[PDB]
Structure 1
Amino acid sequence: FHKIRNEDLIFNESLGQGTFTKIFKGVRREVGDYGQLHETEVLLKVLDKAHRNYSESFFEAASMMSKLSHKHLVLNYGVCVCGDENILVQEFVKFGSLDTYLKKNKNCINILWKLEVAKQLAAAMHFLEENTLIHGNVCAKNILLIREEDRKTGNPPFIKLSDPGISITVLPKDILQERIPWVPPECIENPKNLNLATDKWSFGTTLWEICSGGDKPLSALDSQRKLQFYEDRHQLPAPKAAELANLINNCMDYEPDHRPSFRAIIRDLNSL
């Protein structure tokens, strides 16, 4: 990771928080191409000082993403580890996370929008699967909307997958349980079961989010009831707009070996 000086970063408004992290809009002063000076909008992800022990997993998350280059994977500019802070410096995506975009735009997002976003996510996960790289935290909050759909120009929406954050292989047990049903049942049983098949399950959950206008599946269940949901081998309800319901359940297969490759997922998406 390229090291960025604290003096070159300006922290502006908070944009929320993630697991043991706080998120800020910021500005990076930098010398760019041809020696031109730029003041670039950036997304600054700050690991909580009280959780500095998760720094290696905080940064191994992004670093994996950033050893590969792909149009659907978020760009990391570098890190700032001056002083006591652990900061990931990331491209700033105009329209933020998909989970909140889906909510604020329910009565405006149709099946063709959801299908194109689903295809793009499948393309990014296919690229990861071909490179045998595990993401570990596929969810709507981790999908960034680069570009809105512009019907008047034929332009589809364009999304990127963000970095996974601290791995579920080191997170507290209660956080993992609150992440049901994104975290697969085999990883609730044993977090060290994290596997390429993990992302197939979470991709199913993420499609459910995309089809459900920002609702969180099982949000009404507390952690104990979510565990029992897995113990009784339940599937999620079909979204009202059920066009993707079969793919969702096919991906969320309690047998990890039976979950379809992302190539087959793309083939099924292209038939709708």
Structure 2
Amino acid sequence: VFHKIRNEDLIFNESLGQGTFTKIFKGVRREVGDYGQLHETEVLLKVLDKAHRNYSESFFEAASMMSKLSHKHLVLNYGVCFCGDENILVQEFVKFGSLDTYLKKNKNCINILWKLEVAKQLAWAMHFLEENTLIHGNVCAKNILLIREEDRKTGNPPFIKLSDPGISITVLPKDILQERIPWVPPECIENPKNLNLATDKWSFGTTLWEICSGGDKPLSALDSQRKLQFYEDRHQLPAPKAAELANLINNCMDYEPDHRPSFRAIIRDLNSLF
């Protein structure tokens, strides 16, 4: 159960746009920290309308279940504000934000070894979730958060976290799932009840395609109906220009869910590209 944060300890400063049925803000939380020190902590606030009850329950149950598994590559949620007509997730503010925007802002001037390190870190997060049999269900580059940039002097790589899962595709409207092709796997387009650990292997492949493509969105030129035809004709994504990960992408985006490799196997594969 999330720690309850009082509305009077939350300051909303900047509107940052929308997620899927969420409104996003930057703000500050006033809190008591270690040694009793009084802090004003930068937070990322995700607002859900309590009138969308099924969506809010799904969102917060997913955030809560993943925050029960503390891990270096999983986002920190500080708690929640049951804030009148809205329920608000109070999350850590990750300094460099979403990875797809970061890669665009850096004009894909990122070397393959950087991409390999981020891919390995996500794979280790996903292996942890797999070992815990916890489905994330919305793995994508917008949900990879860059804590720190590479530091060439120390040799330290970039460091990422995986963000909260959001509303489950088992409750979302079908038209939203189709818009989310090719992150949502073919079996879930056929029936959202096919959500499974295998779902995250597919979406991991799509996310590696994003990373290798400098934050482009696959199939962006296709409307929903052509995205369904993509899957009907069982096509595979084009190799990214950073084609070093094309084989892994295709191996994870296997139309047969039971053939998608374990994250332990994915990590070994990534290591062998060094």
Q: Scaled by the length of structure 1, what TM-score is found? A: 0.98
In the other structure, the counterpart of 1:177 is: 178
1:48 positional shift:
3.8
User: Could you list the per-position Cα deviations for residues 2-58 of structure 1 after superposition, in whole angstroms to 9, with x for gaps in the alignment?
Assistant: 110000000011122100001110100001111111100010001146634411011
User: Could you list the per-position Cα deviations for residues 151-182 of structure 1 after superposition, in whole angstroms to 9, with x for gaps in the alignment?
Assistant: 12211000000011000000000000000000
CA–CA distance in 2 between the matches of 1:210 and 1:10?
34
Is the Cα–Cα contact under 8 Å of residues 74 and 91 in structure 1 kept in the other structure? Answer: yes
User: Could you list the per-position Cα deviations for residues 125-171 of structure 1 after superposition, in whole angstroms to 9, with x for gaps in the alignment?
Assistant: 00000111100000000000000011122110000000110000000
User: Which has the larger displacement, 40-49 or 197-206?
Assistant: 40-49
**RMSD after superposition:** 0.9
CA–CA distance in 2 between the matches of 1:152 and 1:169?
46
CA–CA distance in 2 between the matches of 1:37 and 1:142?
30
* Identity across matched positions, percent: 99
Is the Cα–Cα contact under 8 Å of residues 45 and 90 in structure 2 kept in the other structure? Answer: yes
Is the Cα–Cα contact under 8 Å of residues 22 and 48 in structure 1 kept in the other structure? Answer: no
Is the Cα–Cα contact under 8 Å of residues 51 and 85 in structure 2 kept in the other structure? Answer: no
Q: Which runs of 5+ in 2 are unaligned?
A: none
Residues paired across the two proteins, number: 272
User: Could you list the per-position Cα deviations for residues 161-213 of structure 1 after superposition, in whole angstroms to 9, with x for gaps in the alignment?
Assistant: 00110000000000000000000000000001100000000000000000001
CA–CA distance in 2 between the matches of 1:64 and 1:235?
33
CA–CA distance in 1 between the matches of 2:45 and 2:250?
35
Q: Scaled by the length of structure 2, what TM-score is found? A: 0.98
CA–CA distance in 2 between the matches of 1:48 and 1:16?
15
1:107 positional shift:
4.1
Q: Which runs of 5+ in 1 are unaligned?
A: none
Aligned-partner SS, 1:106: coil
CA–CA distance in 2 between the matches of 1:50 and 1:100?
31
Aligned-partner SS, 1:209: helix
Is the Cα–Cα contact under 8 Å of residues 52 and 86 in structure 1 kept in the other structure? Answer: no
Matches within 5 A, 1:1-272: 1-48=2-49, 51-272=52-273
Is the Cα–Cα contact under 8 Å of residues 49 and 85 in structure 2 kept in the other structure? Answer: no
User: Which has the larger displacement, 113-122 or 149-158?
Assistant: 149-158
CA–CA distance in 1 between the matches of 2:109 and 2:177?
33
CA–CA distance in 2 between the matches of 1:50 and 1:236?
38
Is the Cα–Cα contact under 8 Å of residues 44 and 89 in structure 1 kept in the other structure? Answer: yes
